[PDB]
């Protein structure tokens, strides 16, 4: 009864960072060996657990967040980070446990004319709470006059699309990011290693 990490790390279509995808992993044996067995993963990185100790402990209520961001925005997926996606798209808590798997996906998430399926939030009056999602596509009012739902000046659409193209440099090429969260809790531990 292996955990469905293959679907998470092998899905054809990831989610946009403003509407990042959430999956609950529980009641299954998880072999994190396959995760590291992926050669191309450019960021197998984390803070509060040793990478070799993943298979040596049993957790409960594992969470997987999948999305796609720029190359230079990967550094914002970390505790205590400020930026665009960290403040308005995906806020990791300061006391985060679990960790982040980022790999280049220019071969898949990029089109010659530009891939406009991936999007991020640019405007928000206040920062996101940790692990909070916002999908409200309401005309952002950056000014006094209420335009009442029509775009224009001082009224902008809060979501902007990445123009992923295959000739972009490393830093603006698409990157697939999966954040695993190991939330220990007072319950029978479910997700154990081999």
């Amino acid at each position, epitope marked *: 009864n292996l955990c469905p990490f293959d679907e998470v790390f092998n899905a*054809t*279509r990831f989610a946009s960072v403003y509407a990042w995808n959430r999956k609950r992993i529980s009641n299954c044996v998880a072999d994190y060996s396959v995760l590291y067995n992926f050669a191309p993963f450019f960021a197998f990185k984390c803070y509060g657990v040793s990478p070799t100790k993943l298979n040596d402990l049993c957790f409960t209520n594992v969470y997987a967040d999948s999305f796609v961001i720029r190359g230079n925005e990967v550094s914002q997926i970390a505790p205590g980070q400020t930026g665009n996606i960290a403040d308005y798209n995906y806020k990791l808590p300061d006391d985060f446990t679990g960790c982040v798997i980022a790999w*280049n*996906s*220019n*071969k*898949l998430d*990029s*089109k*010659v*004319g*530009g*891939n406009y*399926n991936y999007r991020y939030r640019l405007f928000r009056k206040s920062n996101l709470k940790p692990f909070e999602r916002d999908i409200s596509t309401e005309i952002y009012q950056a000014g006094n006059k209420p335009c009442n739902g029509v775009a224009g000046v001082n009224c902008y659409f809060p979501l902007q699309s990445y123009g992923f193209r*295959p*000739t972009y440099g490393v830093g603006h*090429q698409p990157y697939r990011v999966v954040v695993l969260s190991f939330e220990l809790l007072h319950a029978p531990a479910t997700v154990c290693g081999p």
Partner: antibody
Amino acid sequence: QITLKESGPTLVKPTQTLTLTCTFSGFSLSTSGVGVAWIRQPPGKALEWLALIYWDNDKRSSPSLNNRLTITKDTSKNQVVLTMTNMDPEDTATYYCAHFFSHYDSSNYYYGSWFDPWGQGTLVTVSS
Amino acid sequence: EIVLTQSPGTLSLSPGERATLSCRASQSFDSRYLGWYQQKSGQAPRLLIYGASSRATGIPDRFSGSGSGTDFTLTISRLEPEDFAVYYCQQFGDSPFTFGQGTKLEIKR
């Protein structure tokens, strides 16, 4: 080695709609980066790209002709159907379906892309 | 819209000598977006060069490409009797993807 063959009505009446079916063998519309493109060549003129459908059902059309051009795919039958409406006499041409692919190499560097094998081509005319 | 202008409009060279074709783009895009195709008399066009310098599979070493900014060239060192056709430069930079007007290589006499 891959092949593509176009079929449909080669005698299309004016201000009506045509449907063209390209059946391809040697590849399937499931590999990443693989697409089917439709291009047309007017008699005695240069080529003009019409449409391009990807493996993930993402479709692109010429902005000057996207208002009357629809492109659909059937992976099970390995077919691509181009429907074009509102014909004019100047739309007479030869239509090719071509395989579209890109070339990345072990680091996603994108050493360019191309329109590799083109279909044999169907000469479609618009007249009364 | 990106417009690609080929030069010369017509070209005649007896077999054995050097063939040069040029393609100039209205806008500036990456050199990896431009390819060269060859179409013979009453034939479907076949890929010749992709990425403006990467020869297609099976194409003999007589075909070479060199691109920079908004100037691209296709060079044929040895041109054989079967190498006379129409040559198109096309781009994948911006939608819609556009071809060149073409260049007819002619058998001189």
